[PDB]
mmCIF file of C-alpha atoms in Angstrom:
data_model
loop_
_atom_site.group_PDB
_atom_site.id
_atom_site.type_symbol
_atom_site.label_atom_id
_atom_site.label_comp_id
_atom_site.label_asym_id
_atom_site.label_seq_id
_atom_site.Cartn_x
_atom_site.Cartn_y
_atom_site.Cartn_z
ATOM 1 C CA UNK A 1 -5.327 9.753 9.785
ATOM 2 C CA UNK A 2 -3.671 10.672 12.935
ATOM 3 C CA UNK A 3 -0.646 7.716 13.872
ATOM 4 C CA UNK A 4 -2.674 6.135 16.257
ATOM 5 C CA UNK A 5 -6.250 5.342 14.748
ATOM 6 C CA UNK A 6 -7.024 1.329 13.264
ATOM 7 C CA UNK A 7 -6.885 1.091 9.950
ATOM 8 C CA UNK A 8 -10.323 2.228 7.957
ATOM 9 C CA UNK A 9 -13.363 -0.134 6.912
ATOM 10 C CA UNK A 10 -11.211 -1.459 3.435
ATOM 11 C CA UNK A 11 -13.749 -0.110 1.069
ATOM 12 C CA UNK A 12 -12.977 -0.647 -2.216
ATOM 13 C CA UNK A 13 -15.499 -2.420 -4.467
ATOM 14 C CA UNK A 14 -13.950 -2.895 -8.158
ATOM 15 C CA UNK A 15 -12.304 -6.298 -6.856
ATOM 16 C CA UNK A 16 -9.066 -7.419 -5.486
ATOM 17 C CA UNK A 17 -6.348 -8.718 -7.796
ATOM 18 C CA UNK A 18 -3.015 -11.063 -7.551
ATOM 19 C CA UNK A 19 -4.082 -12.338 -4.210
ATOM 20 C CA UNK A 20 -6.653 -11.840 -1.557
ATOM 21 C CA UNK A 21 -6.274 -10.653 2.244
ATOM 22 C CA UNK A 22 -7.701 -8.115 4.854
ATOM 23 C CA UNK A 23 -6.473 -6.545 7.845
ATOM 24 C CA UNK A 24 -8.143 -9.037 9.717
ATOM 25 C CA UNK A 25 -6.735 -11.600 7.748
ATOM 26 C CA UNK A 26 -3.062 -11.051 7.997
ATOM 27 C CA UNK A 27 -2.553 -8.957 11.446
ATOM 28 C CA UNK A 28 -1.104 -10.638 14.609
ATOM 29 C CA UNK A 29 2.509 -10.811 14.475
ATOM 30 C CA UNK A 30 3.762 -8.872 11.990
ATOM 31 C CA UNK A 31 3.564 -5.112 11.367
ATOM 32 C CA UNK A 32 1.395 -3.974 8.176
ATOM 33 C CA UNK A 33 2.515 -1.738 4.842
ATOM 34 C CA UNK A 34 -0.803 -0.356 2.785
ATOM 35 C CA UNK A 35 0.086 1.743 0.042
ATOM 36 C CA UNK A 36 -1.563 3.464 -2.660
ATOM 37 C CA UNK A 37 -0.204 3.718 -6.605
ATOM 38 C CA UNK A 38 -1.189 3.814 -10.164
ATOM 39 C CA UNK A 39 -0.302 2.549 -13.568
ATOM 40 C CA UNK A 40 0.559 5.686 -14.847
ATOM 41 C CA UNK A 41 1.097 8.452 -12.297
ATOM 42 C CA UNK A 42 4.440 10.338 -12.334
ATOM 43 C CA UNK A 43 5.721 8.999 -8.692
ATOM 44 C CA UNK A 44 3.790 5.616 -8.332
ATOM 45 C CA UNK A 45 6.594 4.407 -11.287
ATOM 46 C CA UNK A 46 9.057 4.864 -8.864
ATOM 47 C CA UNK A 47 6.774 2.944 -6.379
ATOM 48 C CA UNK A 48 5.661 0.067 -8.442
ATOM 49 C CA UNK A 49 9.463 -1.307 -8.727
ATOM 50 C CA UNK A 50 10.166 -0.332 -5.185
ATOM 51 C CA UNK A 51 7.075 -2.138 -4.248
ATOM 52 C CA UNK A 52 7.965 -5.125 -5.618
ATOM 53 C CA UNK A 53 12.076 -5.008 -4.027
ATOM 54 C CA UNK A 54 10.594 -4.504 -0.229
ATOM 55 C CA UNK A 55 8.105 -6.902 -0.813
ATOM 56 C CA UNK A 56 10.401 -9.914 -1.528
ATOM 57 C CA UNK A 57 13.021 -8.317 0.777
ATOM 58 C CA UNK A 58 10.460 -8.086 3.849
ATOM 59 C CA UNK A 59 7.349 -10.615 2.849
ATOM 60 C CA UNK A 60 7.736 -13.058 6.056
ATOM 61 C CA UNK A 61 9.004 -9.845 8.518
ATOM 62 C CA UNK A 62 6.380 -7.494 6.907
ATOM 63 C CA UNK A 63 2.310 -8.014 5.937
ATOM 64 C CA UNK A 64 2.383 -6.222 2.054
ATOM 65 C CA UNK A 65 -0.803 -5.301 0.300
ATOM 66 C CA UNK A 66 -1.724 -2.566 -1.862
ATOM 67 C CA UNK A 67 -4.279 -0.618 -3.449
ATOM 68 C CA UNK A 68 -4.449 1.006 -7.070
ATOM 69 C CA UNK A 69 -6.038 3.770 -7.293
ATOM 70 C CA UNK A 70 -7.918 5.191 -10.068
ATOM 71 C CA UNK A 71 -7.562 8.670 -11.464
ATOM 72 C CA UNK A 72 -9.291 8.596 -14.364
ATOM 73 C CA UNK A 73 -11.145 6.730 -17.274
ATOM 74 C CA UNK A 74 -7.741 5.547 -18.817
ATOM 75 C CA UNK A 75 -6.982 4.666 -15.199
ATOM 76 C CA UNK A 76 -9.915 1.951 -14.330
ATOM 77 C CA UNK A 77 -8.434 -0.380 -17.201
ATOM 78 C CA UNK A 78 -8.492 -3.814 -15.540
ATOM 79 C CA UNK A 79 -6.743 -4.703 -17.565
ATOM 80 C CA UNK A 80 -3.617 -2.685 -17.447
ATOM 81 C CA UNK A 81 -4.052 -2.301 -14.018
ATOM 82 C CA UNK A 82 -3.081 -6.193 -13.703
ATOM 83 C CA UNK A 83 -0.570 -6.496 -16.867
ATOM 84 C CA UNK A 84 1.254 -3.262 -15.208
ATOM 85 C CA UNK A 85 1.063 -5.300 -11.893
ATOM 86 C CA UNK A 86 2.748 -8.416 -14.035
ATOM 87 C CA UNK A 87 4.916 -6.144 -15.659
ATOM 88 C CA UNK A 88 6.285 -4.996 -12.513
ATOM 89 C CA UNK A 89 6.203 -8.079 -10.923
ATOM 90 C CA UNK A 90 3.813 -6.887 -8.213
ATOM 91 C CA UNK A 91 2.867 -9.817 -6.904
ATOM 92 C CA UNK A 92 1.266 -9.000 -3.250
ATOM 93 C CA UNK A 93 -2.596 -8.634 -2.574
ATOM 94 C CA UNK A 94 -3.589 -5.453 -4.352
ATOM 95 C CA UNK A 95 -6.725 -3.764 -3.649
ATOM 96 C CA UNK A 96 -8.632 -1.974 -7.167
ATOM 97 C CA UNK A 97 -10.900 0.722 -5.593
ATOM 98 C CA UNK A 98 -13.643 1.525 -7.436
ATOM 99 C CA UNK A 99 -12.517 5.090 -7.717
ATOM 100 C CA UNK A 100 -11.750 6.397 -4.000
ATOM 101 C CA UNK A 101 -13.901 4.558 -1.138
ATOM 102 C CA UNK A 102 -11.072 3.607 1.234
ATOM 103 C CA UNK A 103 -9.337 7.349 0.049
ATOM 104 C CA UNK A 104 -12.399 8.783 1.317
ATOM 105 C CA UNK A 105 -12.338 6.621 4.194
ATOM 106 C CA UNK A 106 -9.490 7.435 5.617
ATOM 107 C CA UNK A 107 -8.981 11.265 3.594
ATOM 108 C CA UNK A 108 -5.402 10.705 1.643
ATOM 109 C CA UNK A 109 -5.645 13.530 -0.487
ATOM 110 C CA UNK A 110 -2.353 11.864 -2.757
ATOM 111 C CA UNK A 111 -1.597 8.932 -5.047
ATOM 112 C CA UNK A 112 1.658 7.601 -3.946
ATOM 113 C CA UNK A 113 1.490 7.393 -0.602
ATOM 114 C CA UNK A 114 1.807 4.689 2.225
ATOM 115 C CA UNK A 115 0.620 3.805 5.539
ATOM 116 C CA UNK A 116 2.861 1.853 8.144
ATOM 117 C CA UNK A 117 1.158 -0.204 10.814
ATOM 118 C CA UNK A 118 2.146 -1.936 14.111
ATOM 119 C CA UNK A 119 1.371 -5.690 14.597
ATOM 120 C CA UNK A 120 -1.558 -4.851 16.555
ATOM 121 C CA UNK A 121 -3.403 -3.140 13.777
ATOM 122 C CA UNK A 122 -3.354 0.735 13.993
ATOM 123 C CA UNK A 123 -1.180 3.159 12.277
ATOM 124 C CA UNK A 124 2.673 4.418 13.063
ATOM 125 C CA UNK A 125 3.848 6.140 10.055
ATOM 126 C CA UNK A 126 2.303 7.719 6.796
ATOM 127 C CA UNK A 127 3.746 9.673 4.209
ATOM 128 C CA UNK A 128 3.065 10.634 0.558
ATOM 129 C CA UNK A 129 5.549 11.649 -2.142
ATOM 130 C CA UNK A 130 9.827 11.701 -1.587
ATOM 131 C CA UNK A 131 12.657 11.364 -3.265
ATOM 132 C CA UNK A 132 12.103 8.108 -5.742
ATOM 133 C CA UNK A 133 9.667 7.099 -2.575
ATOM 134 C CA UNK A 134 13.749 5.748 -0.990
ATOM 135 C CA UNK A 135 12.507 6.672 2.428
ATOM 136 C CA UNK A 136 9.520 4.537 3.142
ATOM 137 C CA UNK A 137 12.096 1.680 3.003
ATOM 138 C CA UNK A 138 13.756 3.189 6.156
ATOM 139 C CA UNK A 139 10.393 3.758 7.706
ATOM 140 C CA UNK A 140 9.315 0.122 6.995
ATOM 141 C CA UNK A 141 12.540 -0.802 8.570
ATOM 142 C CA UNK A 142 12.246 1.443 11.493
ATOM 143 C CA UNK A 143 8.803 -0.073 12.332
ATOM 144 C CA UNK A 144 9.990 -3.698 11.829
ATOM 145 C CA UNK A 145 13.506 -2.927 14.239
ATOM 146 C CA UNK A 146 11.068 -1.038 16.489
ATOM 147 C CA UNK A 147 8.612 -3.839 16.429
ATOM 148 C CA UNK A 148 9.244 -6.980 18.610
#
């Protein structure tokens, strides 16, 4: 992903969960936050409540959706996947991939990792990993001062 390209095709084929948007759904006037997390890896805990704060904080200033991201038989659980999402009060559009389509799609390589986009529809900022994941809220709010 160089911070420049559109964002990828949205691959992801298990379903969508707790609500239902696209890129070309949501994007016109406000900037975009896609991130990626799971219900039981060792950094996304630190993202799922964070998630959840910057998505009530930001919701009308900021376009939220999400993906989970399985890693692993345990991980597919639809089940969990949307009680942790309850649990956590994740509430935005979240993506399931089936395993890694959009991943592949766009070449991550991490779990816990985020992807911040201008109002027109291509990418500013990404990161992966940090310090309880504290700093994406500064880059979210760097992209939504720096936005008009």
């Amino acid at each position: 992903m160089k911070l420049r390209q559109p964002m990828p095709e949205l691959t992801g084929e298990k379903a969508w969960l707790n609500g239902e948007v696209t890129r070309e759904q949501l994007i016109g006037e406000k900037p975009t936050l896609i991130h990626f997390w799971s219900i039981s890896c060792h950094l996304c805990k630190e993202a799922m409540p964070q998630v959840n704060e910057f998505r009530d904080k930001y919701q009308d200033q900021l376009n939220v959706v999400a993906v989970h991201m399985p890693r692993s038989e345990d991980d597919l659980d639809p089940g969990k996947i949307k009680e942790t999402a309850a649990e956590h009060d994740i509430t935005q559009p979240i993506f399931v991939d089936s395993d890694h389509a959009l991943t592949d799609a766009f070449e991550n390589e991490y779990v816990p990792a985020y992807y911040v986009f201008d109002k027109t529809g291509q990418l500013r900022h990404f990161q992966a990993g940090g310090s309880g994941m504290k700093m994406l809220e500064k880059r979210v709010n760097r992209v939504l001062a720096e936005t008009e």
